[PDB]
């Protein structure tokens, strides 16, 4: 039994949180969606990988930050 282990999100600047992901049969890699859940900041980004294309990392940043870059 192992369904109570908390993992660690690989931070890369902004604090993003996972709310939901999407899968595609035509794509080998899954679609992970996150969102900058900072004090007052509510940005939502989408991490999708273009399969049909020669490895295309299409990322859509919905919203603008309002807390500057962390230290």
Annotated binding site for Zn(2+): 36, 38, 41, 65, 67
Q: How far is CA 53 from CA 23, 29, 30, 46, 70, in A?
A: 17, 13, 15, 17, 34
Q: Which is nearer to Zn ion, 26 or 70 (CB)?
A: 70
Minimum distance, C-beta of residue 65 to Zn ion, in the bound complex (Å): 4
Q: Which is nearer to Zn ion, 30 or 60 (CB)?
A: 60
**By the 8 A CB rule, do 35 and 9 touch?**
no
Q: Which is nearer to Zn ion, 18 or 65 (CB)?
A: 65
As beta bridge partners, residue 45 has 34, 61
Q: Which parts of this chain interact with Zn ion (CB under 5 A)?
A: 14, 36, 38, 41, 43, 65
């Amino acid at each position: 039994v192992q369904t109570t282990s908390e993992v660690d999100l690989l931070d890369d600047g902004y604090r993003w949180r996972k709310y939901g992901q999407k899968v595609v049969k035509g794509n080998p890699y899954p679609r992970s969606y996150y969102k900058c859940t900072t004090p007052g900041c509510g940005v939502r980004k989408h991490v999708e990988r273009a399969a049909t294309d020669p490895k295309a990392v299409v990322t859509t940043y919905e919203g603008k930050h309002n807390h500057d870059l962390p230290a």
